[PDB]
Amino acid sequence: TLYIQGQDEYYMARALKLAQRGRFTTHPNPNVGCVIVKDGEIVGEGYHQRAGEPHAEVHALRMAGEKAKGATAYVTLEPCSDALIAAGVARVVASMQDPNQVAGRGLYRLQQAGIDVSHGLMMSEAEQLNKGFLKRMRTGFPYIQLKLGASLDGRTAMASGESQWITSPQARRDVQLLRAQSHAILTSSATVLADDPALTVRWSELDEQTQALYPQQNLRQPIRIVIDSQNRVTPVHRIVQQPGETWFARTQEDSREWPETVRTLLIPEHKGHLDLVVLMMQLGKQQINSIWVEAGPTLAGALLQAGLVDELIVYIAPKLLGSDARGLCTLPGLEKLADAPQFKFKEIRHVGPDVCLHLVGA
Amino acid sequence: TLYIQGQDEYYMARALKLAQRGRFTTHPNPNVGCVIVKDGEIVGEGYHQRAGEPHAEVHALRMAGEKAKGATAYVTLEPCPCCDALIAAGVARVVASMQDPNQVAGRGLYRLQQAGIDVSHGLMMSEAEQLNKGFLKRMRTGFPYIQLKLGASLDGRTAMESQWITSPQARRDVQLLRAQSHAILTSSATVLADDPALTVRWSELDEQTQALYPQQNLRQPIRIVIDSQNRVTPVHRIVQQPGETWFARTQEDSREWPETVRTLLIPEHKGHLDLVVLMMQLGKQQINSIWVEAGPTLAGALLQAGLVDELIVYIAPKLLGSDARGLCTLPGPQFKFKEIRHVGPDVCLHLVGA
Ligand SMILES: O=P(O)(O)OC[C@H]1O[C@@H](O)[C@H](O)[C@@H]1O
């Protein structure tokens, strides 16, 4: 009665924890956790590491071997569309049913062979495990995190230079970790021209996330997405010569030679500007789960007005900035924002000498 | 010692908790708490309520009467005439959290030691220190402790005027912070534009309501308004509230004002009213702590003058473009974070000088 329903919450939670372990390497695939239990003991465990790699269930099955037969297989996301049939499990508990609403019902496919199925357990948590992916699936759009670095009174970088203010070493290290689980990193050409950044993940800037999993060589570099209407960023720029891909969102094709890692996407304009909504969506088709935006004032405002921001992370430095510095703060152009997907605070924490304010449209 | 030390820490903590109790009514006097222990048991407690009323030690001593003979007194501040009370009561051992801020007057402990009383100081001073930031700073430097408050949207645009765009619970919070500050400083422009009352409304408190501060004990913080030119009128709401209002003037106003209005004459400095001298003058006037409700211009002035001890920043989850822009001026003092906390849908970030 209560014994089975209370013991489920132990093992499901264990499956969620394992799923979390692939969050850095898993794109465009979702995070899935699997735990197989036989009268009181975990006979098999597994989670999804990479896109080419085996699924979580496959891993746990290989581990469990013949011990899989008896009882319960705790999963995070409905399987299939196989193994658990031949494996011989009775009972599989899936945390959530699967987004894609058409062909997304092969949960019953297991009960077809008399398995005691069941879903919905700790779904709240399993949803939060795959925000990006689940949003790309349900809606057309990737999940967007806008990062801002401002001073006490809004304002950034002391000058207009569309460069991003990187508030502290601690703030940089914090962002690295947030970058590392993001599918892609987005920026504007104006930032690349002003900062010449690498926008990669340096492994050495991660903590005990370093061990828990994500060993050195497994390091996955998020896709680098750059907006420039005009093709102002030059192939000599640091960003394109980093390991991994870097995709330019161009108003028209470039004429030059770019390293093999570079790709281009063609995006129509909208009122003299490259259309961000079409872009976002085109990145959708491209299987992009989640974007981390390192933006100047202009880009950040455009995203907010275009209603494309899911959550914004604000790093505040303990400075008040001089006469009239830039920053999204107190600057004309942004008219109908008070009247557009407004946000609410989720978390606030110290980051070295800075504070980080998490908000989300909710 | 180990038990005695832990035992001391308990009683001092209590004396600190008691001192806090009069933090709303105590100005310009410090908050002070006293616990008197007679082999194991608290035989007298007291704290300071009001400038006119008795000291914490006296209150406690009257509750202890005869029981004070034997042993220990835990005081929040070096005591004191108020030093003859303890000797007369016949206590062995007193423990003060910190010595007198004034380093001319520090020998209050020597006085008791002479009567053969076992003295000691230092215990939980960090906390005593925090209990009286302003009074302590006024004794130390010539100056009051300035708390600058700012209210803004995410994009720093000015979003805090009681139909505030910020929030209810934020107003409730601000009211609490006003209620325990000695004075509220503002500028004419704020007074002219908003016509505020700059008072504490007892109805906007909470369990502080009980904590102490009954309705009639309500002490209205001193209202201080800057106007070089004498723009504010006797008919503005600010001057008709219960309590005093003080105009920082550059030259004497000629009008008839209520008995509760004073004016302080302040010299100029490069064609503006010299803020530093104002602060000094208020210091001499015994103002412990100024809670600033100003607009951008004044906020920038105080900052550039190096006069801001801490700042309390309220942010609302709004973003703006509603020609209500601004927050700070700064025709060019830098901070470090202390506490950050939620206040309903808003956050409030406390920062201090360094
Ligand atoms: O009228 P009360 O509620 O005292 O205060 C009005 C407020 O509105 C503004 O003018 C000031 O910043 C002040 O804090």
Curated annotation (Swiss-Prot), chain A:
Give the catalysed reaction(s), semicolon-separated.
2,5-diamino-6-hydroxy-4-(5-phosphoribosylamino)-pyrimidine + H2O + H(+) = 5-amino-6-(5-phospho-D-ribosylamino)uracil + NH4(+); 5-amino-6-(5-phospho-D-ribitylamino)uracil + NADP(+) = 5-amino-6-(5-phospho-D-ribosylamino)uracil + NADPH + H(+)
Give the record's pathway: Cofactor biosynthesis; riboflavin biosynthesis; 5-amino-6-(D-ribitylamino)uracil from GTP: step 2/4; Cofactor biosynthesis; riboflavin biosynthesis; 5-amino-6-(D-ribitylamino)uracil from GTP: step 3/4
| Annotated NADP(+) binding sites | T156, A157, M158, A159, W165, T191, D195, S229, G296, P297, T298, L299
Molecular function in Gene Ontology: 5-amino-6-(5-phosphoribosylamino)uracil reductase activity; diaminohydroxyphosphoribosylaminopyrimidine deaminase activity; NADP binding; zinc ion binding
Q: Which residue ranges does the record annotate as region Deaminase?
A: 7-140
For biological process, the GO terms are: riboflavin biosynthetic process
| Pfam families the record matches | dCMP_cyt_deam_1, RibD_C
Q: Which residues form the active site?
A: E57 (proton donor)
Q: Could you confirm whether the keyword Metal-binding appears in this record?
A: yes
Cofactor(s) demanded = Zn(2+)
Write the Enzyme Commission number(s) for this entry: 3.5.4.26, 1.1.1.193
Name the SUPFAM superfamilies for this protein. Answer: Cytidine deaminase-like, Dihydrofolate reductase-like
At the top level of its lineage, which domain of life is listed?
A: Bacteria
Mind listing the UniProt keywords for this protein, alphabetically?
A: Hydrolase, Metal-binding, Multifunctional enzyme, NADP, Oxidoreductase, Riboflavin biosynthesis, Zinc
Q: Which family does it belong to?
A: In the N-terminal section; belongs to the cytidine and deoxycytidylate deaminase family. In the C-terminal section; belongs to the HTP reductase family.
Q: Which PANTHER family match?
A: 2,5-DIAMINO-6-RIBOSYLAMINO-4(3H)-PYRIMIDINONE 5'-PHOSPHATE REDUCTASE, DIHYDROFOLATE REDUCTASE FAMILY PROTEIN (AFU_ORTHOLOGUE AFUA_8G06820)
Biological function? Converts 2,5-diamino-6-(ribosylamino)-4(3h)-pyrimidinone 5'-phosphate into 5-amino-6-(ribosylamino)-2,4(1h,3h)-pyrimidinedione 5'-phosphate.
What protein does this entry describe? Riboflavin biosynthesis protein RibD
What is the originating organism of this protein?
A: Escherichia coli (strain K12)
Q: What is the lineage of its organism?
A: Bacteria, Pseudomonadati, Pseudomonadota, Gammaproteobacteria, Enterobacterales
Q: State which gene encodes it.
A: ribD
